Amino acid sequence: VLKGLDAVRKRPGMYIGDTDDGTGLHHMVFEVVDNSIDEALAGYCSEISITIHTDESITVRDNGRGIPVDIHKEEGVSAAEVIMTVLHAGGKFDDNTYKVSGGLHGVGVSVVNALSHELRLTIRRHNKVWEQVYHHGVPQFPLREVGETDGSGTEVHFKPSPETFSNIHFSWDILAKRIRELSFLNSGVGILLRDERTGKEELFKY
Numbered sequence: 057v058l059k060g061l062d063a064v065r066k067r068p069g070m071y072i073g074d075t076d077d078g079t080g081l082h083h084m085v086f087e088v089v090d091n092s093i094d095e096a097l098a099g100y101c102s103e104i105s106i107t108i109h110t111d112e113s114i115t116v117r118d119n120g121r122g123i124p125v126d127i128h129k130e131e132g133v134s135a136a137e138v139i140m141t142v143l144h145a146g147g148k149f150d151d152n153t154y155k156v157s158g159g160l161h162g163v164g165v166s167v168v169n170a171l172s173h174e175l176r177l178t179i180r181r182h183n184k185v186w187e188q189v190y191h192h193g194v195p196q197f198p199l200r201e202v203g204e205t206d207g208s209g210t211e212v213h214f215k216p217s218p219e220t221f222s223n224i225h226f227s228w229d230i231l232a233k234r235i236r237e238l239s240f241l242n243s244g245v246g247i248l249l250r251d252e253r254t255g256k257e258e259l260f261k262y
């Protein structure tokens with residue numbers, strides 16, 4: 057019986073949705089972006105960028121508070137690592153978790169992490185820069201300090217795993233349609249979509 061991220065990599069459809077028709081693939085982006093939008097709603101984030109790279113990887117960057125980096129007392133690793141590597145169980149008995157189709161809503165970034173062959177996390181918090189890298193959800197090394205900064209926020213770069221997803225090709229139109237909606241709802245945040253494949257860029261703002 058598989059638990060945790062093992063369960064996710066075994067049956068990714070139960071979490072992210074269909075892994076062949078583009079549903080799950082675009083859900084990966086929105087699961088990351090929704091965490092930034094959480095920062096916007098809380099009044100800490102005014103800037104989100106979403107970049108599609110020429111290798112069909114994604115970079116989401118926000119100017120929110122930065123994922124917490126303190127050592128977690130119970131796990132003995134950074135809070136950020138716990139958030140990245142533990143399947144969140146708080147939603148399991150909430151109505152809003154379960155979709156008619158397309159997997160789960162609010163699955164968490166740890167599911168994005170599990171289904172990415174590489175995920176690079178860069179946090180600006182407490183005037184330091186912190187970085188962690190993962191592969192298929194497994195940390196390569198503990199979160200570590202790599203510099204100083206005068207700002208704060210979170211950057212996630214992820215490469216969808218071809219062993220989970222087929223037809224790995226992001227759609228500007230699918231992303232823009234949701235981003236329009238999020239921009240409408242969250243008027244204090246500007247959301248930049250950047251497509252390095254086509255050279256196209258657009259800033260979405262209420």
Ligand SMILES: Cc1[nH]c(C(=O)Nc2nc3c(N4CCOCC4)cc(C(=O)O)cc3s2)c(Cl)c1Cl
Nearest residue numbers: 088091092095116120121122123124165210212
């Ligand atoms: C691109 C991107 N951005 C983020 C991102 O900013 N997440 C953040 N989460 C929190 C946070 N948690 C605590 C645990 O319950 C959920 C909220 C607390 C604090 C704080 O108390 O200071 C701040 C933050 S910032 C994520 Cl995740 C991703 Cl992916």
Ligand SMILES: [Ca+2]
Nearest residue numbers: 090091162163
């Ligand atoms: Ca959420």
Ligand SMILES: [Ca+2]
Nearest residue numbers: 119120208209
């Ligand atoms: Ca900030």
